[PDB]
Design a protein around this ligand. Structure first.
Ligand SMILES: Nc1ncnc2c1ncn2[C@@H]1O[C@H](COP(=O)(O)OP(=O)(O)OP(=O)(O)O)[C@@H](O)[C@H]1O
Ligand SMILES: Nc1nc2c(ncn2[C@@H]2O[C@H](COP(=O)(O)OP(=O)(O)O)[C@@H](O)[C@H]2O)c(=O)[nH]1
Ligand SMILES: [Mg+2]
Ligand SMILES: [Mg+2]
Ligand SMILES: [Mg+2]
Lengths: 352, 132, 101, 208, 80, 51
């Protein structure tokens, strides 16, 4: 238990815990993370039968900022950046666990690149004929949003009347669960249900009803290019997509009562070179202008202490099965091949 | 700054590398100004970079700065391996240098692409032969 | 005194094409654009078609200047492969050697 | 070859060189002095001194490589090794303490043992006698037994019977079956043995 | 237009507009009625922020340029 | 896909350096290519091909 910590409350993590793995309870995994976790980390949780996250400085710094957030001031945009596989996504997940355990409303977009590529059913929006709806993407997110924030969905009540069809319409004063359920049940109305959910939460957080965390991973997708093409085969632009148009509005710092934590990702990005990782290189001019002012937070490769704890955690679970891995000579090779990169180390240790 | 270093050269196929090995370091390697795990995403290439230092059991004790031009990813890694090994000979003992030579780490690989000859499909590949 | 009647026919084609090159260039310019009226471009289409057939540059053939061979000619020397090799193998072409590598 | 006959193959063994001089015998000492005067070939770009280097898996990866695409071949091998490890971990976690002891979770031990189980002890060679071709039981060299096991396993995974199944899943499934002395590849070994025992009376046809 | 300009000028830029708006909302949250454009944009902190943004927009983006921009924004937003 | 400033600067440079100033499609640009070079029949290699 050298690599593990007994403090499982993300609100009590400090610098003493750097390098130690804290256990996320199975209940939190089902509720707080129906979809946020990286795909290969989800495999580890299945194989090890436990979700343990290393307390690192990038999250510790960003948890400190969120503990001292002035809810009166406009929401601050925190941007996690760093090289490929350094731990940006799992740093964002550590923070989401903190805010989720403090009864914040979580608006977690697991990957914004999925909204700008590989769309089979791009339907023209009825609310605005110049914008396109993404029924499958909206419905998928709505189901998970319902799971994470089921507790609050009854308390939050819409403050307007929303006309779905000629026949159906949501009335003022009904719970927000109804809007979420309509989008889930009727998938043609899912994109508009997401727009309303985002519109209602932004307004009602400023009124002081709840604290809203906007956790968008892969945010650089919003101001980039799309691979979605019209019927005439002309390239569609991100602004025309309804889900992107509505999420962009959440990114502006014109509301208060919460924080906006985002993470960059070149993985899954469109029209970006492999080694692009700095904010302006990935966000672009339009993206940087939208987020400016923001607080960049660097995520780096494991430091010597962190690297040792990661190997100890794998050894404690018996994941490293090669007879030379536990030895000092093996560890030196593990370090050189990855260079302390968390993702390369996990991928190399997966078959040893 | 008074830090000992040894420049060397290597060659593999059409690639040519120049490696500066510092007597003391932390194990940092920079290829064309880029960290080696970024410049060499393929694991096989990084394994070749580790072969010289591992064989003499000096991983993490030297800082290397190399520049490689020409060839492909594998040829560049092979060229850098030769450049690093020859430069690192300055800091290892004479006996260790002999072991490096006997392990294949100090020989320039002469295997280069063979030309294509006229009347044939390839360097050795012949056109289909028809007895009748 | 040209190598054969075929060379002599190509000699006349190269001469007639040279004489008509300017007139053909001027008329083609009228045709090779979308600016001028199609009525004018149609008259130019007829005018260039009425010029003698042997003024058309596509009818010129690069024959070997020594033997009149219509194919296998190297354009830099204007010689057929058989005649070029005869001069090269005897060391009579400056700087040309057998290639081995 | 671009190497002259004088060039010798490199010996990429760290432990060999570190061996103290006292351990070395008189003949072993001569071998070291001779090598100092001999030209050595450049080490190939495949094998290194890493402690994680396994020759059998290296050979298997090369036997799966198509058109020089070693990156894809190495990718498939590591995906297979991870698949075997993950499957065994699931079986271990779902097993009782007594059963858990006997469950092997090392993907390299399973790979070696599975291939060893598939190695044929005896072979058949076609021989022509009196205008007829006979399959005569013969002893097989050690190199040919190991190659046959690897070739049989790879051929089974490449068969059309498997429909839209990726190679890491196919190979991991086949390897675990052979590790337990089951599956088609083991049947191929048994068929060779049973076809050679039936032709035991033709063993005298062999002249070597 | 600003697209044509080959040199980024912080004046009349989105950065100037965005930081001004953020600072005005912050003053309103404190219930301070000092909303003078000139005073807000004349502070030393704004000068550090202007310098950082111009460097990022006109020179090669590196780790050091993003750290300087980080510290300038943290001071203007009262993040410690 | 050009700004008014970029378009007018490109047209000034074209006037300065002697390039086509009016908007011209690729088909009509052949007229410029036709009169900027000698016709193939007028090149010495062509009409003086034979001795
Ligand atoms: N804090 C952490 N605790 C435990 N494992 C971690 C942590 N950070 C990273 N890892 C390991 O590294 C892998 C990569 O993490 P993550 O997906 O967060 O990286 P990333 O930098 O967001 O990647 P990308 O640049 O591709 O978006 C994880 O799957 C996990 O195995
Ligand atoms: N179907 C439907 N969708 C609505 C309605 N009101 C808002 N929305 C959706 O919610 C989003 C946010 O609302 P709003 O701020 O009015 O959007 P805007 O008009 O595009 O600026 C819109 O883009 C729509 O997708 C409504 O009455 N009906
Ligand atoms: Mg990520
Ligand atoms: Mg070939
Ligand atoms: Mg012709």
């Amino acid at each position: 238990a050298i690599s593990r910590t007994n403090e499982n409350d993300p609100a009590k993590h400090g610098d003493q815990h750097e390098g130690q793995h804290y256990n996320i309870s199975p209940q939190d995994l089902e509720t707080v993370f129906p979809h946020g976790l990286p795909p290969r980390f989800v495999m580890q949780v299945k194989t090890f039968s436990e979700a343990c996250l290393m307390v690192r400085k990038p999250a510790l710094e960003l948890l400190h900022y969120l503990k001292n957030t002035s809810f009166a001031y406009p929401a601050i945009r925190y941007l996690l950046y760093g090289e490929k596989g350094t731990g940006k996504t799992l740093s964002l997940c550590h923070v989401i666990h903190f805010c989720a355990k403090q009864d914040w409303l979580i608006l977690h977009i697991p990957d914004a690149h999925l909204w700008v590529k590989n769309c089979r059913d791009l339907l023209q929006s009825s609310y605005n004929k110049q914008r396109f709806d993404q029924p499958l993407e909206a419905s998928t997110w709505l189901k998970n949003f319902k799971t994470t924030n089921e507790r609050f969905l009854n308390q939050i009540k819409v403050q307007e009347k929303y006309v779905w069809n000629k026949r159906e319409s949501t009335e003022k004063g009904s719970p927000l669960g109804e809007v979420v359920e309509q989008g889930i049940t009727r998938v043609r109305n899912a994109t508009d249900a997401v727009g309303i959910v985002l519109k209602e939460l932004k307004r009602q957080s400023s009124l002081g009803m709840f604290h809203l965390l906007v956790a968008v991973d892969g945010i650089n997708a919003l101001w980039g290019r799309t691979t979605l093409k019209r019927e005439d085969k002309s390239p569609i632009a991100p602004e025309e997509l309804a889900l992107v148009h509505n999420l962009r509005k959440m990114m502006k710092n014109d509301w208060h009562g919460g924080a906006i934590v985002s993470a960059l990702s070149q993985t899954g990005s469109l029209f970006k070179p492999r080694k692009a990782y700095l904010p302006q290189e990935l966000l672009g001019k339009e993206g940087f202008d939208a987020l400016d002012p923001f607080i960049p937070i660097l995520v780096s490769n494991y430091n010597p202490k962190e690297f040792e704890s990661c190997i100890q955690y794998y050894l404690e679970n018996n994941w490293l099965q090669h007879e030379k891995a536990p030895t000092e000579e093996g560890k030196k090779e593990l370090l050189f091949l990855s260079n302390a990169n968390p993702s390369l180390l996990e991928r190399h240790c997966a078959y040893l | 700054q008074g830090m000992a270093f040894s420049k060397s050269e290597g060659k593999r196929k059409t690639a040519k590398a120049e490696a500066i090995v510092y007597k003391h370091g932390s194990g940092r390697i920079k290829v064309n100004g880029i960290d080696y795990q970024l410049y060499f995403p393929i694991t096989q290439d990084r394994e070749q970079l580790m072969f010289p230092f591992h064989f003499v059991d000096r991983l993490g004790k030297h800082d290397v700065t190399c520049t490689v031009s020409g060839g492909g990813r594998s040829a560049q890694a092979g060229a850098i391996r030769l450049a690093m090994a020859k430069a690192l000979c300055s800091f290892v003992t004479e006996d260790e240098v002999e072991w490096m030579r006997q392990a294949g780490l100090l020989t320039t690989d002469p295997r280069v692409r063979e030309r294509k000859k006229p009347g044939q499909e390839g360097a050795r590949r012949k056109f289909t032969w028809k007895k009748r | 005194h040209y190598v054969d009647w075929r060379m002599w026919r190509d000699v006349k084609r190269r001469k007639m094409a040279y004489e008509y090159a300017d007139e053909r260039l001027r008329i083609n310019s009228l045709r090779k654009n979308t600016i001028l009226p199609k009525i004018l471009q149609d008259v130019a289409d007829e005018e260039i078609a009425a010029l003698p057939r042997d003024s058309c540059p596509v009818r010129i053939r690069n024959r070997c200047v020594m033997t009149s061979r219509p194919r296998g000619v190297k354009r830099r020397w204007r010689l057929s492969r058989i005649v070029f090799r005869h001069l090269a193998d005897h060391g009579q072409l400056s700087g040309i050697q057998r290639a081995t590598w | 070859s671009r190497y002259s006959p004088e060039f010798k193959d490199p010996l990429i063994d760290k432990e060999y060189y570190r061996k103290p001089v006292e351990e070395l015998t008189e003949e072993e000492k001569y071998v070291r002095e001779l090598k100092k005067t001999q030209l050595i070939k450049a080490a190939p770009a495949g094998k290194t001194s890493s402690v994680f280097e396994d020759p059998v898996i290296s050979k298997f990866t090369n036997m799966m490589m198509i058109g020089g695409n070693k990156v894809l071949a190495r990718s498939l091998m590591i995906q297979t090794l991870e698949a075997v490890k993950r499957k065994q971990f699931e079986k271990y976690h779902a097993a009782s303490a007594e059963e858990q002891a006997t469950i092997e979770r090392n993907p390299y031990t399973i790979f070696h043992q599975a291939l060893k189980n598939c190695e044929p002890m005896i072979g058949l060679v076609p021989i022509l006698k009196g205008g007829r071709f006979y399959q005569v039981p013969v002893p097989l060299p050690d190199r040919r037994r190991r190659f046959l096991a690897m070739k049989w396993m790879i051929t089974e995974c490449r068969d059309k019977k498997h429909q839209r199944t990726l190679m890491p899943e196919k190979l991991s499934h086949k390897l675990l079956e052979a590790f337990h002395n089951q599956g088609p590849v083991i049947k191929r070994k048994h068929d060779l043995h049973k076809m050679a025992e039936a032709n035991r009376a033709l063993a005298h046809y062999r002249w070597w | 237009t600003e697209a044509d300009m080959e040199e980024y000028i912080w004046e009349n830029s989105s950065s100037e507009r965005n930081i001004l708006e953020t600072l005005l909302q912050m003053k309103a949250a404190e219930k301070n009625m000092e909303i003078n454009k000139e005073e807000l944009l004349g502070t030393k902190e704004i000068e550090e922020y202007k310098k950082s943004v111009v460097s990022l927009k006109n020179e090669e983006e590196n780790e050091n340029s993003i750290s300087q921009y980080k510290e300038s924004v943290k001071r203007l937003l009262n993040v410690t | 896909s050009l700004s008014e400033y970029a378009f007018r600067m490109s047209r000034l440079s074209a006037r300065l350096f002697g390039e086509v100033t009016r908007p011209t499609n690729s088909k009509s640009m052949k007229v410029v290519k036709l009169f900027s070079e000698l016709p193939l029949a007028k090149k010495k290699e062509t009409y003086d091909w034979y001795p």
